[PDB]
Design goal:
This is part of a larger assembly, with chains A, B, C and D. Chain B is an all-alpha fold. Chain B is about 40% helix and about 0% strand. By secondary structure, chain D is α+β, with helices and mostly antiparallel strands. Chain D has one domain. Classes of the chains: A mainly alpha, B mainly alpha, C alpha/beta, D alpha+beta. The structure holds magnesium ion (MG) (30 copies). Chain A binds one RNA strand through helix 1, helix 2 and helix 3. Chain C: One of its GO terms (molecular function) is small ribosomal subunit rRNA binding.
Chain lengths: ~90, ~60, ~120, ~110
RNA sequence: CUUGAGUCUCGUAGAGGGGGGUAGAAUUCCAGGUGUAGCGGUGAAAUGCGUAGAGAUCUGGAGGAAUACCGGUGGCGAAGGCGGCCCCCUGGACGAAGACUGACGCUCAGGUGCGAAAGCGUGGGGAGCAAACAGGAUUAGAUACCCUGGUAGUCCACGCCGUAAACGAUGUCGACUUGGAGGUUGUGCCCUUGAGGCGUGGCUUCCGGAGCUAACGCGUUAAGUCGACCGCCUGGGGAGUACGGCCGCAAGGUUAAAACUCAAAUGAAUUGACGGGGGC
């Protein structure tokens, strides 16, 4: 999956605090990182459905988190979709 | 019977051929756990180690060679 | 021609026939004779007595080389194969060892569908 | 960079190659910042079954810690060589710097 | 707000998936060596194979497909399914102790995807096996049946197909409700620790209580006691058929009637028969 260093860096990047790993933004960012990574994987292993299942799962979970965020406070939602380049 | 738990090895490596040939028939075939009483986890580890050894020609696949 | 005095025997033993042939540590065969090579046919050619007579007519057919001991490569569960090996045992050969060389594939090929009744 | 336990058997007639082949190989590894955690030779050693009509090849073990790129280059080196009759690399959970039931008993 | 649901840290197990290597058996073929008249098959033979030298045996090679022992109703996966070994890429689960988010949840028509085998298209490959076909055993007649051959297919790539007794014949999620024996995988504590003893999770098998059920049975992994949502049924046959629509290259799939016809059809269990079976 994601290297510990990548997760730590992303947590620092989007985390309101150091150990704040539960905030919706850091979750969305982690899922986005992993999805962008797996893009290259599935570009090569097209017949690997069993992991594409997990990929699609985390895509849908990012969608659910984004919707929760957007309907909770649209400001942070806009900031996040700008930093990550999403909803497009 | 519950040997490796009494010994406590963290992993049955393939190099220790001396401790393998007693889990092997004279024909070279692996002996089931229900005969040697090894715990299933270490039985799996033994199977993997034995297959690796057979590959490195430390043990024989069979006697027909 | 020459002498060995301790050869190796091979009894290829099918359920329909039983062929026996000897060589000497080298695979260079010396003398062969089949249960079917003795006038027998049908189920008659698949009897341990046919094994007796085939053992005899190989031993005598190779006795020119005058061997005295034997390894035996028993292969295939032909009906009553101890018969021919002890026939040779009595034929003037101190059998050294027996070896089941029945070839066993590691799931290599799909077998044919067996008899249906 | 991950840990590996490379073990290769070289044609015994070429046993005059090992003290230089290991040098070249560990040189590549250390140049790739690969920390050789163990190297062992068990010399010639009888084979459990013939390999290409041959017995008693020459065994070499080496536990290393290197990036996968250079060890892939290394196994390609193995493949294109001919003296090494058969190699095997396998990952391992840590670096092991210890004896072996070969050097401990031979 | 933190109990639901998630995130992070440390680990553990695993035929989970994709890709690429590689190994050793065995089959067939080829090459020769040794070595002749049988081999093979069967009810018995014949077709077939063998004097151009088989078969048997030894050595070498080539090639394809599958991975004995381990192996366990053992494990993994949503299901279909997954079994040599090694590497690369990758999914999920579980445990310990914390920290973090703060209802972010459950279900799901339509929709999207996955989906055994056979089958279809294109191109490969093709050892074994083997629908169809051929031949031998062959009767008013050859089909039976058995043999000896044997193509498609089985394999790979990429497309379709989208159906199975696809079954646990049991939708998903949550809560609650006596026990006993196991398997497997963690983990805490501890006897002097190894062994071994107390715990505490996850998964899984078999008994059985209450209860439930027409009964058989199910029985903390419910077919018990409840809640949320979805799918589906309304006598048998006609019929999962016709027509129409949609989908598919095609085979067909999917959605889905009516006329007519019967007074039954069906489920579980009970008692006997069922002797060219057993035992005494
Ligand atoms: Mg995750
Ligand atoms: Mg796997
Ligand atoms: Mg071979
Ligand atoms: Mg020949
Ligand atoms: Mg499971
Ligand atoms: Mg993983
Ligand atoms: Mg708070
Ligand atoms: Mg639907
Ligand atoms: Mg599809
Ligand atoms: Mg198919
Ligand atoms: Mg095709
Ligand atoms: Mg074709
Ligand atoms: Mg055939
Ligand atoms: Mg046939
Ligand atoms: Mg015919
Ligand atoms: Mg038939
Ligand atoms: Mg396909
Ligand atoms: Mg159906
Ligand atoms: Mg099934
Ligand atoms: Mg059903
Ligand atoms: Mg439930
Ligand atoms: Mg338990
Ligand atoms: Mg019960
Ligand atoms: Mg239970
Ligand atoms: Mg229920
Ligand atoms: Mg009921
Ligand atoms: Mg009706
Ligand atoms: Mg229809
Ligand atoms: Mg239609
Ligand atoms: Mg059309």
């Amino acid at each position: 999956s994601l290297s510990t260093e990548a997760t730590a860096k992303i947590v620092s990047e989007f985390g309101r605090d150091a150990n704040d790993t539960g905030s919706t933004e850091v979750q969305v960012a982690l899922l986005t990182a992993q999805i962008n990574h797996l893009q290259g994987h599935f570009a090569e292993h097209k017949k690997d459905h069993h992991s594409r299942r997990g990929l699609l799962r985390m895509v849908s979970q990012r969608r659910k988190l984004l919707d929760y965020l957007k309907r909770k406070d649209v400001a942070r939602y806009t900031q996040l979709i700008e930093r990550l380049g999403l909803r497009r | 019977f519950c040997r490796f738990t009494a010994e406590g090895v963290q992993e049955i490596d393939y190099k220790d051929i001396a401790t393998l040939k007693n889990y092997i028939t004279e024909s070279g075939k692996i002996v089931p756990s229900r005969i040697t009483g090894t715990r299933a986890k270490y039985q799996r580890q033994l199977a993997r180690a034995i297959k690796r050894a057979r590959y490195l020609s430390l043990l024989p696949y069979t006697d027909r060679h | 021609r020459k002498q060995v005095s301790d050869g190796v025997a091979h009894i290829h033993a099918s359920f329909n026939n039983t062929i026996v042939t000897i060589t000497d540590r080298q695979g260079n065969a010396l003398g062969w004779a089949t249960a079917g090579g003795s006038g027998f046919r049908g189920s008659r050619k698949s009897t341990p007595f046919a094994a007796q007579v085939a053992a005899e007519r190989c031993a005598d057919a190779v006795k020119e080389y005058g061997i005295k001991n034997l390894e035996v490569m028993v292969k295939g569960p032909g009906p009553g194969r101890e018969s021919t090996i002890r026939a040779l045992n009595a034929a003037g050969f101190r059998i050294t060892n027996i070896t089941d060389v029945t070839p066993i594939p590691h799931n290599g090929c799909r077998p044919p569908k067996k008899r249906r009744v | 960079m991950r840990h590996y336990e490379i073990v290769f058997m070289v044609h015994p007639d070429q046993s005059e190659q090992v003290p230089g082949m290991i040098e070249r190989y560990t040189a590549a590894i250390t140049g790739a910042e690969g920390k050789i955690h163990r190297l062992e030779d068990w010399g010639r050693r009888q084979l459990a079954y013939p390999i290409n009509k041959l017995h008693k090849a020459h065994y070499v073990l080496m536990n290393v810690e290197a990036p996968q790129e250079v060890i892939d280059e290394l196994e390609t080196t193995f493949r294109f060589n001919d003296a090494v009759i058969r190699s095997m690399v396998m990952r391992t959970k840590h670096a092991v710097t210890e004896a072996s039931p070969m050097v401990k008993a031979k």
